[PDB]
Amino acid sequence: SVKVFDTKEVQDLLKAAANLNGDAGNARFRQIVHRLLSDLFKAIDDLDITPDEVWAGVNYLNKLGQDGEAALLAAGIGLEKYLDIRMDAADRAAGLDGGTPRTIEGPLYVAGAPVRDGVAKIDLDDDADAGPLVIRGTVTGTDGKPLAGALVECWHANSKGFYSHFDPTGAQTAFNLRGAVRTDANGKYEFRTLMPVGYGCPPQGATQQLLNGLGRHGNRPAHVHFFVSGDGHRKLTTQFNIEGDPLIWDDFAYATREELIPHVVDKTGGAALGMKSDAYKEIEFDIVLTPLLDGRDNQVVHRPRASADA
């Protein structure tokens, strides 16, 4: 067995490849690339990764991008959760850890949903196998005061586990099961929707291929995603899990938090809300936002996101 990482030839190659001694340029980017390349080269050296293994990994990266799944893989190997862990640690160090917990966004947000006042009905497509669901709650700040005019956005899957704009069967209308509500004067919001079923990775796709190699499933428990925002407060990325889903603590993207599992309550009187049956389920999901730090939101995330027109 041979080791070459700590040799002058290898260190010169890394310096050249990242252009550390180049003209003035993007020093931060060169610093990051040098670190990632150095770590990769050292891992190849330490584990004696063969050329055949490396070229299989290179081939995998081609498939990953061809499938458009790099952000799904980021969820599946815990990187997305890891970013939340680092934001959580920064919040604890600054006393901003008293609100509704964050969790991962996932890769399926779509911008452009219509904003309603107080109540939105977001099931645009018929879904016979999904029962009616009312999600409602109150938004407050950590101080305790309800927040009027706060913007509550949600998105979730249908009974086949698919999201609109990402449904491979093409069966969904634009913005089905996606919507936004401005809270009323008492901080209240309400979504009228249908019950989600859990998501699973595209079985032929790159993420599931890698999970298969690891001996891992690619499934998520049923859940609903949220963005919540409002004047004077930081933007919350969160979700809640559907109580009783047996995958709730075995999510392939590691998103579950014990504070984010509200009760599912059987109700009647559905016709008064325009639901499709008298019997329906209600989930009360109250949300607590944190104030800005020095007038700034130190944890909002910019990433590529889909958009569409109504």
In the list a second copy, Zn ion, none, the entry touching 59 (Cβ below 5 to 8 angstroms by class) is a second copy
What's the rounded Cα separation, in Å, for the pair 160 and 98?
36
When binding is defined by CB under 8 A, the residue of 9, 258, 266, 309 that contacts a second copy is 9
What's the rounded Cα separation, in Å, for the pair 2 and 174?
57
163 marked as binding residue: yes
199 marked as binding residue: yes
Q: How far is the CB of 95 from a second copy (least distance, A)?
A: 13
124 marked as binding residue: yes
Q: How far is the CB of 41 from Zn ion (least distance, A)?
A: 23
Binding to a second copy (CB under 8 A): which residues in 206-245? 210, 213-216
Which residue, 86 or 263, has its beta carbon nearer to a second copy?
Answer: 86
Which residue, 156 or 234, has its beta carbon nearer to Zn ion?
Answer: 156
Decide: is 10 part of the binding site for a second copy (CB under 8 A): yes
Binding to a second copy (CB under 8 A): which residues in 47-106? 47, 49, 51-56, 58-59, 61-71, 74, 76-79, 81-83, 85-87, 89-90, 93
Q: How far is the CB of 8 from a second copy (least distance, A)?
A: 11
Q: Which residues contact Zn ion (rule: CB under 5 A)?
A: 106
Element (H or E) spanning 80, and its range? helix 79-93
126 marked as binding residue: yes
Please give the residue whose beta carbon sits closest to Zn ion in the complex: 106
Q: How far is the CB of 187 from a second copy (least distance, A)?
A: 28
Q: How many of the other CB atoms lie within 10 Å of CB of 57?
A: 12
**Tokens in use for 22?**
């180049």
Q: Which long-range contacts (CB under 8 A, 24 or more apart) does 204-211 make?
A: 205/67, 205/69, 205/72, 206/60, 206/63, 206/64, 206/66, 206/67, 206/69, 206/73, 207/64, 207/67, 207/69, 207/72, 207/73, 207/76, 209/60, 209/63, 210/60, 210/73, 210/76, 210/77, 211/76, 211/252
12 marked as binding residue: no
What is the DSSP code string of 23-76?
SSS-HHHHHHHHHHHHHHHHHHHHHT--HHHHHHHHHHHHHHHHTT-HHHHHHH
Q: How far is the CB of 11 from a second copy (least distance, A)?
A: 11
Chain CA centroid to CA 157, Å: 13
Binding-site residue numbers are 97, 124, 126, 163, 199, 223, 225
Annotated binding site for Ca(2+): 97, 124, 126
Binding site for Zn(2+): residue ranges?
163, 199, 223, 225
